[PDB]
Amino acid sequence: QPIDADVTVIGSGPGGYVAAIKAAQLGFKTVCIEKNETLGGTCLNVGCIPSKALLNNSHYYHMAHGKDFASRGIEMSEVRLNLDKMMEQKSTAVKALTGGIAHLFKQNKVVHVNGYGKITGKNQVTATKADGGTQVIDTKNILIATGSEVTPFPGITIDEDTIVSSTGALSLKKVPEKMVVIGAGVIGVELGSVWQRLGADVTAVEFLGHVGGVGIDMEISKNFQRILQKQGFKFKLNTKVTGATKKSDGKIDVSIEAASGGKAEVITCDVLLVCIGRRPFTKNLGLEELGIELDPRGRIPVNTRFQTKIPNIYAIGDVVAGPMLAHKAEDEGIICVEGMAGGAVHIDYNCVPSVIYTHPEVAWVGKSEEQLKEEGIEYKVGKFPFAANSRAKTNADTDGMVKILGQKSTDRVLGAHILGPGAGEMVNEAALALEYGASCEDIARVCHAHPTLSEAFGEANLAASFGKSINF
Amino acid sequence: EVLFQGPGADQPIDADVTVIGSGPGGYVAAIKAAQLGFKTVCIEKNETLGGTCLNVGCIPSKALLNNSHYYHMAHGKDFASRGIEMSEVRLNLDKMMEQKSTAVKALTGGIAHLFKQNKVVHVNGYGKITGKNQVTATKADGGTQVIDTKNILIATGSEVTPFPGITIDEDTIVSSTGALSLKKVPEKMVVIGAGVIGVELGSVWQRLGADVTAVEFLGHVGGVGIDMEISKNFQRILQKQGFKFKLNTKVTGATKKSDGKIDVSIEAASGGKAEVITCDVLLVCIGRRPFTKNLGLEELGIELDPRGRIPVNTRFQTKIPNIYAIGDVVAGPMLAHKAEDEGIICVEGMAGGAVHIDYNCVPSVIYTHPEVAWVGKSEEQLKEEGIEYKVGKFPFAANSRAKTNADTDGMVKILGQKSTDRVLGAHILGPGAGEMVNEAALALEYGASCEDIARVCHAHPTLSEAFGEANLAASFGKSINF
Numbered sequence A: 001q002p003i004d005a006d007v008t009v010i011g012s013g014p015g016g017y018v019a020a021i022k023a024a025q026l027g028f029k030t031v032c033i034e035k036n037e038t039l040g041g042t043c044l045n046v047g048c049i050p051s052k053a054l055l056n057n058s059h060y061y062h063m064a065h066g067k068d069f070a071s072r073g074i075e076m077s078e079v080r081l082n083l084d085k086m087m088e089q090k091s092t093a094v095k096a097l098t099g100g101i102a103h104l105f106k107q108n109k110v111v112h113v114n115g116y117g118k119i120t121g122k123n124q125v126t127a128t129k130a131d132g133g134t135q136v137i138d139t140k141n142i143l144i145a146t147g148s149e150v151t152p153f154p155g156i157t158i159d160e161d162t163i164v165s166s167t168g169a170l171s172l173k174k175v176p177e178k179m180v181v182i183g184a185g186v187i188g189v190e191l192g193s194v195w196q197r198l199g200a201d202v203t204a205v206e207f208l209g210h211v212g213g214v215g216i217d218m219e220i221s222k223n224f225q226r227i228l229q230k231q232g233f234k235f236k237l238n239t240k241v242t243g244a245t246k247k248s249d250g251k252i253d254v255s256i257e258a259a260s261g262g263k264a265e266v267i268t269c270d271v272l273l274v275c276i277g278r279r280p281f282t283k284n285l286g287l288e289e290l291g292i293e294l295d296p297r298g299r300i301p302v303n304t305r306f307q308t309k310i311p312n313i314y315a316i317g318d319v320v321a322g323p324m325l326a327h328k329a330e331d332e333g334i335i336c337v338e339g340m341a342g343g344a345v346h347i348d349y350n351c352v353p354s355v356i357y358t359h360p361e362v363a364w365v366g367k368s369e370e371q372l373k374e375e376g377i378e379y380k381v382g383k384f385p386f387a388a389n390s391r392a393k394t395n396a397d398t399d400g401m402v403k404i405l406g407q408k409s410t411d412r413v414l415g416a417h418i419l420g421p422g423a424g425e426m427v428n429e430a431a432l433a434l435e436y437g438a439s440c441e442d443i444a445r446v447c448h449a450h451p452t453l454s455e456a457f458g459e460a461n462l463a464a465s466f467g468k469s470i471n472f
Numbered sequence B: 001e002v003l004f005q006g007p008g009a010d011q012p013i014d015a016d017v018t019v020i021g022s023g024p025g026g027y028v029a030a031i032k033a034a035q036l037g038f039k040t041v042c043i044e045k046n047e048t049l050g051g052t053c054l055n056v057g058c059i060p061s062k063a064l065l066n067n068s069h070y071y072h073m074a075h076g077k078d079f080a081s082r083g084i085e086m087s088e089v090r091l092n093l094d095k096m097m098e099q100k101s102t103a104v105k106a107l108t109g110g111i112a113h114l115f116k117q118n119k120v121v122h123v124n125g126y127g128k129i130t131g132k133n134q135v136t137a138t139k140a141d142g143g144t145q146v147i148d149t150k151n152i153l154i155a156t157g158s159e160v161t162p163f164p165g166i167t168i169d170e171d172t173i174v175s176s177t178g179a180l181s182l183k184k185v186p187e188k189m190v191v192i193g194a195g196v197i198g199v200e201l202g203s204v205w206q207r208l209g210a211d212v213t214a215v216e217f218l219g220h221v222g223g224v225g226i227d228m229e230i231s232k233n234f235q236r237i238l239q240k241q242g243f244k245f246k247l248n249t250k251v252t253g254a255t256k257k258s259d260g261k262i263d264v265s266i267e268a269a270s271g272g273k274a275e276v277i278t279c280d281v282l283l284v285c286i287g288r289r290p291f292t293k294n295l296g297l298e299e300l301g302i303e304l305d306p307r308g309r310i311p312v313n314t315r316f317q318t319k320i321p322n323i324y325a326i327g328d329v330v331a332g333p334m335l336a337h338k339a340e341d342e343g344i345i346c347v348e349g350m351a352g353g354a355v356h357i358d359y360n361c362v363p364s365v366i367y368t369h370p371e372v373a374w375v376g377k378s379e380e381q382l383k384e385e386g387i388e389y390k391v392g393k394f395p396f397a398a399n400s401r402a403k404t405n406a407d408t409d410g411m412v413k414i415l416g417q418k419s420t421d422r423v424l425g426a427h428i429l430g431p432g433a434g435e436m437v438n439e440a441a442l443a444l445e446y447g448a449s450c451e452d453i454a455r456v457c458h459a460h461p462t463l464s465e466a467f468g469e470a471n472l473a474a475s476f477g478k479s480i481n482f
């Protein structure tokens, strides 16, 4: 009863489920092992999918309940939130896509093994089911796609009741009266804004001086924070949390101080969301016994084919270095297995976009101004505001700008940074541009349809290339 | 103000470039010509700048499409399915029209401010070319102003094409202009022509509560060059929304009746099956055509083509070499971004630059919900050119952003060259088509392959992943998620 495979994938998130599918499409006898009830990993079950659903639903709530719909002649006397039903739309979307992956596995003849996978030899993986039953897979290659987990806050114990991670925050049973968020990174700002739109009094506390996490352009970050403050989202930047006490009355007392030191203070809230980071997950996988050592941050070191020290054991996604993003994991999955089959293996982390699905959105790809200064690159800047864009103006949705960074000597686009409507979709045109080594002039000369938000991308590139846009 | 020459301002002007018309082609050409260091004049006959597009075209239409879509989401099922519960969703049409008007006004004022900032001299009057190097503007007060100029750029745009025997009065018989400003939602509307303008304006009124039928002489919706499979799928979706179609049908006449309603007589296009349909508002949108009235063309010897366009060469020169023409008044797709691009490169050409534009990289968009957008070649075009191609498709129903948003109609279709994998056409029916097609336009500019695009790290979850998936299916034979 051992299964014989060519490729055994441990984990079914964006890295592993896509790697399983592609490996099957390339002709490899393929197994995928998953410990959880459903397939899809962090992204589908407790990440990107439920968060974007709540961002969409909460945005439309705000449009209806606030001023926006009345200003377009859509009149309603009495707009009410039904939170159970909003959660149910979220849950339905999750269920359909997790079902979708099960179908795709059958369609592609990927064998799904349920259980906790442990590498029990160079060419062997053992999955242990919840009742203790085992299934052994003897296998040519092993692909580790075990992903990430929440980074705990030392001294504060998450219980998913009143002190929640992202997981708990995606499923609160009612709108909290007061919420504090620790970490103003991408996840914190998205979940904070959801709850703020729905009625919560929300403050994010962040040790650093800016919101939106690592690599966000500083000017874009400042402009983004100012807009969110005007919506009602409060921030205490440059601020340390010392501790948090669960109280007898169900509330929480949170002690903070300036990050440099000084001014202690206590803030009370009904829910504390702890989202200071995420970290690679390799627990009880069998690495120590194989001699595969981790790097100081818990990642598995790999070569450019994604091979560990043991050349038939591979790793991809949130368990390895680079941006902890679902598209990044997916592409590492694809190219790893293409490599197994003898092909070239390339991904360029500089061409991997980041998106924040707030309203307004934020999105960027390539280098920020700060990165270009660190590196000593000589660059120029083009900017165009959405207030001068015809589609944004027609939609009455005009916050933000596109900022382009270009190289003086060659006019090469080095980075694209977008704050405003449609940023998430627009950054894909920018990623193609960076992949192709576009000049700012090339982008300015594309015949962008009129009226589109994309025209602002064209115009900011014109400003960088020629010195001046047309419409501003 | 030397920069505004209205009634009363009639001294002779000297210019390097005189642009006749302030639509997307003309106003942008003026701005760019000034930025290149030419002494530039733009002449406009109407009370506001920005032409057809700003005043009676793209801008007000897009505003009503956006607002009417939201009304649909609120008033039907969508908002309730997200737990957003509302008592009594009511249409305030005056207030919706007012949002539209506000946007138009801010953008027309925007162009006036840009002309100032760039030192473009705005002459308010009817321009007529009165010599190889001369334009005379006649103003509203009867006065005249001579511009002695080295180059002339004709950007006089287009007008609605009339329907013989049906008089547009902008009351119950409207053009696109009248349809953009109706006082009330008609109980029933007939639309003559199922081109882009017709389906957009139909759909607006359908959403707002009208019963709508479009009558079209050809066998498909969405105008010339739309891919036939995309057209059929789109038509089907619009039928399920409640928008009726009579294709392969000609209108033989219309009569305004004593009850205020209109009887529209129709037949099969080939003949027979005579029939009458009745409506409260009749929208006539069979086409648009180039506008060159009283421009001085005959006197100069500039002969028009049989469709009324001004023939020009690859630098946009007419047969008189210092007289140029761009935009809706020349050949090619009658589109704002097309006009604007011709304008820019024409004036770069006057300054000594290269003049290049690849029409196979010019997208078209329909701003319905779902949107339709495309660029490059359709299947029908590739067949008739004898090009060997392969197809990749990916449905929005398998895309995570579309699914999460419960916004899943349509697909992306990519056509790639059977041997080289070169992208030859991209055709998108669904949410976000208008924005997404610009990624495809950029790809086509480079001569990119299906593989090239499949390997771009599109962000997750985005609609654009469907674009990547369809390219992957075209390149490798199979996508990941379908």
Ligand SMILES: Cc1cc2nc3c(=O)[nH]c(=O)nc-3n(C[C@H](O)[C@H](O)[C@H](O)COP(=O)(O)OP(=O)(O)OC[C@H]3O[C@@H](n4cnc5c(N)ncnc54)[C@H](O)[C@@H]3O)c2cc1C
Binding pocket: A010, A011, A012, A013, A014, A015, A016, A033, A034, A035, A036, A040, A041, A042, A043, A044, A046, A047, A048, A049, A051, A115, A116, A117, A118, A145, A146, A147, A148, A149, A166, A167, A187, A281, A283, A284, A285, A316, A317, A318, A319, A324, A325, A326, A327, A328, A329, B459, B460, B461
């Ligand atoms: C709240 C939130 C929102 C997010 N939003 C976005 C977004 O909008 N865009 C974006 O790009 N990214 C987003 N992310 C990040 C994204 O979820 C991750 O980058 C992505 O899931 C990583 O994919 P992966 O395949 O490497 O690992 P994961 O998705 O973490 O999957 C790892 C899988 O392996 C399983 N597993 C682990 N060990 C074993 C074992 N020994 N045996 C069996 N199974 C095992 C796990 O149970 C899990 O299913 C978000 C994350 C969170 C928490």
Ligand SMILES: Cc1cc2nc3c(=O)[nH]c(=O)nc-3n(C[C@H](O)[C@H](O)[C@H](O)COP(=O)(O)OP(=O)(O)OC[C@H]3O[C@@H](n4cnc5c(N)ncnc54)[C@H](O)[C@@H]3O)c2cc1C
Binding pocket: A450, A451, B020, B021, B022, B023, B024, B025, B026, B043, B044, B045, B046, B049, B050, B051, B052, B053, B054, B056, B057, B058, B059, B061, B125, B126, B127, B128, B155, B156, B157, B158, B159, B176, B177, B197, B291, B293, B294, B295, B326, B327, B328, B329, B334, B335, B336, B337, B338, B339, B367
């Ligand atoms: C309802 C509607 C919806 C549309 N939607 C879209 C869309 O979504 N996207 C898109 O790309 N296109 C759209 N279009 C088409 C678009 O409006 C045109 O292709 C575009 O305006 C053409 O630009 P132009 O500069 O060539 O001419 P025009 O915009 O027609 O401008 C010509 C200008 O010249 C002026 N003029 C003419 N003759 C003279 C003279 N002798 N002296 C002085 N002034 C003169 C006119 O008054 C006018 O202001 C739409 C059109 C309509 C009617």
